Structure 1
Amino acid sequence: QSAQAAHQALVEQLDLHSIHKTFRNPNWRPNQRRNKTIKAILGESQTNIESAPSLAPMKHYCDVTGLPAPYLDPKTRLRYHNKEIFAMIRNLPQGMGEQFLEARGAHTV
């Protein structure tokens, strides 16, 4: 069918593997371990000392609706706007509470 033929034509037209590269030197071959993560690079190097903390007191927002939150629930530790959202928060499926924390990088343990 033409749709399959056309798609096969287009993937062959787009493929780089079918194309020979005259500029690519064949003799040099990379070290297979060369792909290293930031933590590996920094740990092996031991200037990415440009990050900055903050000392001002942060505002409190509802973990569900993002509206301002007067209240922190002592049980699930979600911040919440009002009684309607507290009702939801206490009714959440047991795995969901940790997701609302994790959306702001928090976790219960």
Structure 2
Amino acid sequence: ERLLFLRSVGERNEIGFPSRFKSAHYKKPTRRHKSARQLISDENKRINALLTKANKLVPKATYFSVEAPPSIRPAKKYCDVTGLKGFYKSPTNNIRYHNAEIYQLIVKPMAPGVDQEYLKLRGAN
């Protein structure tokens, strides 16, 4: 009953291998994995390759120009535990904290390996 519903939706939307939508010339090439990380690097080395070809006319609009530049005003320090205003920073594991009770309750009895995951959020590893 419940298991017999999904086969009905199955026989509504099948496309056979002789697909009626794609063209007669099919010729599908082999497909790599091509993750999102390596596309940045291969675009980067393509831009560097074209620049090294050109300098030995100057391109201006690139992918490194379309991203946001870093800020000029100083950033705001916040407590790593509560998200309030961080007045103090511990000298051992470099974790900002709000006041004394937060420090004695969380920061002092803290196990190693947790301070990295706390600093992961703001990227301070």
Partner of 1:24: 22
Pairwise CA distance, 1:31: 4.3
Pairwise CA distance, 1:75: 0.6
Using a 3 Å threshold, how does the CA distance of structure 1 residues 66 and 97 change in structure 2: closer, same or farther?
same
Partner of 1:50: 66
Number of residue pairs aligned between Structure 1 and Structure 2: 103
Percent of pairs with identical residues: 28
Partner of 2:34: 35
Using a 3 Å threshold, how does the CA distance of structure 1 residues 36 and 76 change in structure 2: closer, same or farther?
closer
Pairwise CA distance, 1:24: 1.4
Partner of 1:102: 120
Partner of 2:86: 69
Partner of 1:9: 8
Structure 1 runs (4+) deviating above 6 angstroms are: none
Q: Please tell me the residue identity of whatever aligns with 1:23.
A: F
Q: Please tell me the residue identity of whatever aligns with 1:43.
A: N
CA RMSD of aligned residues (A): 2.3
Pairwise CA distance, 1:50: 2.0
Q: Please tell me the residue identity of whatever aligns with 1:104.
A: R
Q: Given the two structures, how large is their TM-score scaled by the length of structure 2?
A: 0.67
Q: Given the two structures, how large is their TM-score scaled by the length of structure 1?
A: 0.76
Gaps of 5+ in 1: none
Pairwise CA distance, 1:58: 1.2
Higher mean C-alpha displacement, 86-95 vs 28-37: 28-37
Partner of 2:55: none
Question: 2:40 aligns to what SS in structure 1?
Answer: helix
Gaps of 5+ in 2: 49-61
Using a 3 Å threshold, how does the CA distance of structure 1 residues 93 and 8 change in structure 2: closer, same or farther?
farther
Distance 1:90 1:81 in 2: 13
